[PDB]
Structures are given as C-alpha cells and as structure tokens.
UniProtKB/Swiss-Prot annotation:
The active site is at E215. It comes from the Bacteria. This is Tetanus toxin light chain. Zn(2+) binds at H214, H218. The chain holds residues 2 to 427 of 1315 of the full protein.
Amino acid sequence: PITINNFRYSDPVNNDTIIMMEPPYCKGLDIYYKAFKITDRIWIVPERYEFGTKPEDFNPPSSEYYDPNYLRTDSDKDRFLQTMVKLFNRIKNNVAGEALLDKIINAIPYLGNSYSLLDKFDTNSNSVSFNLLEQDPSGATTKSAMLTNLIIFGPGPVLNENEVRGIVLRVDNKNYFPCRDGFGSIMQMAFCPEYVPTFDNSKYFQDPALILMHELIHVLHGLYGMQVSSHSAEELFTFGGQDANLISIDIKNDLYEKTLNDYKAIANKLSQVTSCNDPNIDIDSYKQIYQQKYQFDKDSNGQYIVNEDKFQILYNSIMYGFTEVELGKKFNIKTRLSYFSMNHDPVKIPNLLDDTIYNDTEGFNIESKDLKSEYKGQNMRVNTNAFRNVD
C-alpha cells in the first residue's frame, strides 16, 4: 500500500525522509536544500526553481503573475510542504489517482542511457541520482548518492505556470533527454498550489490536485522515456479529451514507431548488462524491474525482446490511460473543454489547509456544504470565500 508521509518543515534531517539534497542541476557544486520524501521515489524541495535563472528574472518586467518573495521563509516553506502533503493525500484517496501514483513510483528511470556503457548499469549520472548529506552514526557528515523518480520544487519566476522537465545531459555538444528516448530520467517539477487557473465554456477555478495530477502525467511520460519532444503534442495527449484527436494519425504513428524502436534498443541493451558501477545494486533484481516496466518478453536464447501487443497496451496506458479530462471525471472536478481556452486571470487559493474550504476526499466540492452538486465548490459565483483575486 502507498503511504504519503507527514513532516514539519523544521523537523530535523534523518537520512531517510528529510535530508539536505544536492539537486541534480547542482551536481558537484555542493549546494544543498532541505528536502522531503512525500512517498517513495518522490521528493519535495520547498524552494523556488532557480536552475538557469537570474535573480532579476524573478520580478514583473517593465496571464503571468510574479512575486519574488513567495517561498523564502521557514513559514512559507512549511505551508507549501503541508499543502503538497494534502494534495498528495487528495490524489491517493481516489482509486484513479492512486493508480497514477503507483505507476509513477514504479516507472523507475533506466540505469543508463543511449551513451552509457552497454553492459553496465550506470547509477552515476545526474539524470538518475542526486547527492545528499548523510549523518554517520560516528558523528561525521558524509556525502552519498540516491536514485529517485521525481523531485518537486516550488515555482520559477512565473508563479502560476508549472513546468515538468527531465534532466538534460550534455553529450557531444548536444542537448540529450533520456526521458525522450525510452530510458527515462529523474523528472523535476516546478509547482505552485496556490495559484490556479479559471475558465468557462458561469465561471470556475481549477482544483489544484487536478493541476498536480496533470503535471504528474507529464512526469509519467518522462519516466517511461516517452516525453513528446518537439510537436505541443505532449500537452494534447496529457489533456486528453477531443484535443488528443488533433494530433494527426500521421504523427501518432511516427511517435509510436519511434518509441517502439527505442524500446527495442533498450531490450537489446538490457540483454548485455552484466555489472553495475554501484555495489548496492542487485543486477538481477533491476533486470526484472525493467522487464516488468518495459513489458519485455524473454526469447528462447535468454535475450529480451519487445512483444508487439504488450508494447501496444503499455503505450496505450501511458499516452491514453491517464488524462486531465478523465481524472477530472473520476474525481468529480470540473474541467475546461479543450486545452485551447483564453487564460482568464488565475486566482489565489489562500487556504487549501482548512477542511471548510478544501478537504482531501472531496476537494472544494464538499457535500456537507452542498457544494458537490454541479461542482458548486469550484463555481466562482457560489463558492466566493474559497478564492481571492490578484494584483
């Protein structure tokens, strides 16, 4: 069973669920931020997403809403953390959302990539590992390495604009994404639970759990090494609905053939693996995990091969099994019709933390307040205390 853990931002590091983490884009730069393991293979780092930014990138210049002082204090950070804990509980408490989390957790990044040694599992790129400080039983503070799937940061410059990105590796003077190429990588999220969009199609604000789950679906594409590159299509598959129907059959077919091919390449790679650089990794245990993850068969030789039909089911469940439209349905959260709607001013949700405004089994749509029906708890003309406008 999946547990979402509990912690207070000020609790002490413990080498387990609270650590000082060197984020992957800080590899070897020895900058550490306090991080929290919400659940296996998922960390929350309550900080602003700052990789590749100037500190002046963080003010309004001269839809997009800024505030450079959001998430800078212990109090800010603790509020953000408790909020994320609630949003993960809200996701997990519906069986649809917990299947999402289970798939994300299980979809571990392959221990290597297109430019990794073919016969070795490689736990040593920043695309699969972060460093931490660990506190020895002897009193010494040492530095180690950990495998993970997802790290969730607070937002970058623009508060109400969440992004998901796989780790970029620099290889032969090129940008390379193991999350586009079958292997997957650590995925990183810049996420802001307080600032959600609005829409009509009679005006509604979005439930932040469903913006979270939309982002987790991008994270799932990426763990499966299926992030859709330059098309965007990634955003249409993720939204689902009739929008998915706009990616032509011609493009669905290149994407499908392309992924089929990477998986074949990975099937071949998995067959050669005879050792790992990291003593702590059980070679045969990881081979089974990856057989299971990629849904490979074994041939008579002992080789791994792609069984076409099992690939088609897997692909189908990755691209079509989880969308915003369907998750909204299953959770009773109201959704836009189509990705393409003028983005009305977002709004602030100042208190997700209070069960009278938002709980973890029903969201804003609390039935004891008779706000379940017709999604009244998301209606801007009905549930007037839940939001605030922004300046």
